Amino acid sequence: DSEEELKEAFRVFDKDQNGFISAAELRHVMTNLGEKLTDEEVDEMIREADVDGDGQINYEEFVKVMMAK
Ligand SMILES: [Ca+2]
Ligand SMILES: [Ca+2]
């Protein structure tokens, strides 16, 4: 199930594992990834993906961002 795989990815991104992805958490995941992004790229991606501006991306939102852009 592709959708199931997406949720696995979501679970991977959420280190805190509270059903939310934070720039800090996302930053750490990208760091482990062996990829080194700047704070601005990380923030811009997060803000671009932050629609409620809440500063965090929930799964539903992650799905919308992951499904599209
Ligand atoms: Ca979180
Ligand atoms: Ca949000």
From Swiss-Prot:
Protein name as annotated: Calmodulin-2
Residue span, EF-hand domain: 1-36, 37-69
Region of the whole protein represented: 81 to 149 of 149
Family note: Belongs to the calmodulin family.
Function (record text): Calmodulin mediates the control of a large number of enzymes, ion channels and other proteins by Ca(2+). Among the enzymes to be stimulated by the calmodulin-Ca(2+) complex are a number of protein kinases and phosphatases.
Residues that bind Ca(2+) 4: 50, 52, 54, 56, 61
Chain sites annotated for binding Ca(2+) 3: 14, 16, 18, 25
Miscellaneous section: This protein has four functional calcium-binding sites.
Signal peptide: none
The species this protein was found in: Glycine max
Modified positions (N6,N6,N6-trimethyllysine) in chain numbering: 36
